Design an enzyme around this catalytic site. Structure first.
Site, PDB file in Angstrom:
ATOM      1  N   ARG A   1      42.567  45.117 130.009  1.00  0.00           N
ATOM      2  CA  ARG A   1      42.360  46.051 128.920  1.00  0.00           C
ATOM      3  C   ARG A   1      43.680  46.217 128.149  1.00  0.00           C
ATOM      4  NH1 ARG A   1      40.897  52.217 129.056  1.00  0.00           N
ATOM      5  NH2 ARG A   1      40.694  52.059 131.344  1.00  0.00           N
ATOM      6  N   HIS A   2      43.572  46.627 126.895  1.00  0.00           N
ATOM      7  CA  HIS A   2      44.732  46.862 126.046  1.00  0.00           C
ATOM      8  C   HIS A   2      45.669  47.868 126.724  1.00  0.00           C
ATOM      9  CE1 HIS A   2      43.554  51.017 125.179  1.00  0.00           C
ATOM     10  NE2 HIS A   2      42.359  50.543 125.468  1.00  0.00           N
TER      11      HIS A   2
ATOM     12  N   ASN B   1      44.293  57.415 124.230  1.00  0.00           N
ATOM     13  CA  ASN B   1      43.999  57.386 125.668  1.00  0.00           C
ATOM     14  C   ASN B   1      44.843  58.493 126.332  1.00  0.00           C
ATOM     15  OD1 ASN B   1      43.451  53.794 126.347  1.00  0.00           O
ATOM     16  ND2 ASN B   1      41.951  55.459 126.320  1.00  0.00           N
TER      17      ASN B   1
ATOM     18  N   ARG C   1      45.178  48.430 119.237  1.00  0.00           N
ATOM     19  CA  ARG C   1      45.587  48.455 120.636  1.00  0.00           C
ATOM     20  C   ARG C   1      45.594  47.103 121.354  1.00  0.00           C
ATOM     21  NH1 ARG C   1      40.689  51.391 119.696  1.00  0.00           N
ATOM     22  NH2 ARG C   1      39.091  51.353 121.324  1.00  0.00           N
TER      23      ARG C   1
ATOM     24  N   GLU D   1      35.417  47.600 120.877  1.00  0.00           N
ATOM     25  CA  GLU D   1      34.882  48.601 121.791  1.00  0.00           C
ATOM     26  C   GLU D   1      33.585  49.224 121.304  1.00  0.00           C
ATOM     27  OE1 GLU D   1      34.469  49.211 124.618  1.00  0.00           O
ATOM     28  OE2 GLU D   1      35.697  50.791 125.466  1.00  0.00           O
TER      29      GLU D   1
ATOM     30  N   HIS E   1      38.642  46.113 125.955  1.00  0.00           N
ATOM     31  CA  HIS E   1      38.525  47.550 126.168  1.00  0.00           C
ATOM     32  C   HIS E   1      37.687  47.852 127.411  1.00  0.00           C
ATOM     33  CE1 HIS E   1      39.583  47.534 121.794  1.00  0.00           C
ATOM     34  NE2 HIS E   1      38.850  46.442 121.845  1.00  0.00           N
TER      35      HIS E   1
HETATM   36  O1  LIG Z   1      39.344  50.693 126.218  1.00  0.00           O
HETATM   37  P1  LIG Z   1      39.016  51.919 125.482  1.00  0.00           P
HETATM   38  O2  LIG Z   1      38.640  51.547 124.071  1.00  0.00           O
HETATM   39  O3  LIG Z   1      40.249  52.749 125.484  1.00  0.00           O
HETATM   40  C1  LIG Z   1      38.071  52.660 126.327  1.00  0.00           C
HETATM   41  C2  LIG Z   1      38.207  53.810 127.253  1.00  0.00           C
HETATM   42  O4  LIG Z   1      37.222  53.726 128.324  1.00  0.00           O
HETATM   43  C3  LIG Z   1      36.257  54.779 128.277  1.00  0.00           C
HETATM   44  C4  LIG Z   1      34.861  54.265 128.097  1.00  0.00           C
HETATM   45  O5  LIG Z   1      34.312  54.010 129.417  1.00  0.00           O
HETATM   46  P2  LIG Z   1      33.366  55.021 130.246  1.00  0.00           P
HETATM   47  O6  LIG Z   1      31.950  54.508 130.263  1.00  0.00           O
HETATM   48  O7  LIG Z   1      33.821  55.079 131.677  1.00  0.00           O
HETATM   49  O8  LIG Z   1      33.432  56.375 129.628  1.00  0.00           O
HETATM   50  C5  LIG Z   1      36.613  55.643 127.071  1.00  0.00           C
HETATM   51  O9  LIG Z   1      36.422  56.985 127.323  1.00  0.00           O
HETATM   52  C6  LIG Z   1      38.032  55.225 126.632  1.00  0.00           C
HETATM   53  O10 LIG Z   1      38.291  55.320 125.188  1.00  0.00           O
END
Ligand SMILES: O=P(O)(O)C[C@@H]1O[C@H](COP(=O)(O)O)[C@@H](O)[C@@H]1O
Ligand SMILES: O=P(O)(O)C[C@@H]1O[C@H](COP(=O)(O)O)[C@@H](O)[C@@H]1O
Lengths: 191, 191
Positions: free
Chosen positions: B8-9, B15, B58, B78, B143
Site C-alpha cells: 500500500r502507498h 490516514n 499517495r 481506491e 490502496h
Molecule cells: O489505502 P487507503 O486509500 O488509504 C485506504 C484506507 O483503508 C481503509 C479502507 O479499508 P476498510 O474496509 O478496512 O475500511 C480506509 O479507511 C483508508 O482510507
C-alpha cells in the site's frame, strides 16, 4: 388470565457481527429495540409487571429503557458456548471441524468444549421455571437458547425439536397459559 | 518463479487524521516509507521490476522514491467512498447512521451513497488482474480496498471474508504464485 412476555435482548454488537456468546452491549439498533419495547410495554397497560433479566449487559441494557426496576437472574444467562465463545459459524467449522459435525448429529445433547448444552441449560432453568409458573405478569428478557427452553416448556415440545424453535431478535412472545397448555401471540417490533 | 509485491502507498496526511478516501499526499512518515521501500526494493535485487500505481498522489509519490519509472493505472484507484469521502468513522455514524448499520450487515455488497462497493471494485479490477497474472516481476503500490481484492484473488478468498483481510500500512506482501495457489511472505518496514 395472566401473560408471560418472553422476548430476547435487543440486538448486540456481537449479534451484528454474526458472532455467538460473549457479554457485549446493545448496538445502536439494539438500543432502539429497548425503547421500542418500552413503548410497547406502555401500550399494553399491564398491572404490576415483573421484569426478569440475566446478568449479561445486553438484557440489562434492554430493561434499563423500561424505566421500571428489574431483577437479575444468573440462571437466565445464555448457554456457555465454551471454547467457541465469540466465534462465527465459519471460525467454528475451521478451528473445530469435528465438534461442528458432532453437533449436527444431536443438537439437544451436544456440549461445547468447556461449556454446556441445551440439556445442561434445561437443568439450570429448573428454578426459573418453578418461580415463573407461579407469578402473575412477567417480562423475561433473555437470550436465544434460554428463550427456547422456556418456550418449549410452556408449549410442551420434545428435546429433539426444542433447539429449532423460532426465537428471532426483536420479537416478543406473549405467553398466556390456558387449560390445554398455553397461548402464544407473536409481536414483532420493526426498528 | 516470479514475485508480485503488493503493498500500500506510504501513510497519507489523511490516514494520519483517521479519515477515509481523498487524494492526499504522503505525510513526512509516509515519505519515509517511500525511501524505506526504496532501500528494500534495492535489497531484493530483482530483474526488471515493473512498478504499477494508481493516479492518486499517495501511490505516485511512494513510487517516485524508487528512482525507476512507473505506469499509472486508473483501475487501481481506491474504492470511491462517495458521499462519505474524507470522513472519520464518527462523522459517518453521525451524519449517516443508517448507511453505517446497513454496511455492517453485508460488507461485500455495501455501496456508499454516490460511490462504489467491493463488488463494483472487483469488476473494475478485472483488467488489472488479467494483465498482472501474465507479467513477471511487479510491484503494485495501491490502496487498502484494492489490495484486498487483488490479494483475495491470488489466495482464493470468499467475497464474504475479502473485506477483512490484513492490509495494514507500511507492509509489503511478496506474492509468489505456485502450483496450489500462491505463497505470501509478509514484510513490515518500521519507520
Ligand atoms: O489505502 P487507503 O486509500 O488509504 C485506504 C484506507 O483503508 C481503509 C479502507 O479499508 P476498510 O474496509 O478496512 O475500511 C480506509 O479507511 C483508508 O482510507
Ligand atoms: O441471545 P443470544 O445470546 O444473542 C443468542 C443468539 O442465538 C444463537 C444461539 O441459538 P442457535 O441454537 O440457533 O444457534 C447464537 O448464535 C446467538 O449468540
Amino acid at each position: 388470565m395472566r401473560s408471560i412476555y418472553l422476548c430476547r435482548h435487543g440486538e448486540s454488537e456481537l449479534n451484528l457481527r454474526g458472532r455467538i456468546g460473549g457479554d457485549s452491549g446493545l448496538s445502536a439498533r439494539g438500543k432502539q429495540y429497548a425503547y421500542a419495547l418500552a413503548n410497547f410495554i406502555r401500550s399494553q397497560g399491564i398491572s404490576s409487571l415483573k421484569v426478569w433479566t440475566s446478568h449479561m449487559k445486553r438484557t440489562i441494557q434492554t430493561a434499563e429503557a423500561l424505566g421500571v426496576p428489574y431483577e437479575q437472574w444468573k440462571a437466565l444467562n445464555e448457554i456457555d458456548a465454551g471454547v467457541c465463545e465469540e466465534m462465527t459459524y465459519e471460525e467454528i467449522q475451521e478451528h473445530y471441524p469435528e465438534e461442528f459435525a458432532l453437533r449436527d448429529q444431536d443438537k439437544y445433547r451436544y456440549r461445547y468444549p468447556k461449556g454446556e448444552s441445551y440439556e445442561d441449560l434445561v437443568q439450570r432453568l429448573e428454578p426459573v421455571i418453578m418461580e415463573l409458573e407461579r407469578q402473575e405478569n412477567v417480562l423475561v428478557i433473555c437470550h436465544q437458547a434460554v428463550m427456547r427452553c422456556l418456550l418449549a416448556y410452556f408449549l410442551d415440545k420434545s428435546s429433539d425439536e426444542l433447539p429449532y424453535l423460532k426465537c428471532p431478535l426483536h420479537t416478543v412472545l406473549k405467553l398466556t397459559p390456558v387449560a390445554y397448555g398455553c397461548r402464544v401471540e407473536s409481536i414483532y417490533l420493526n426498528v
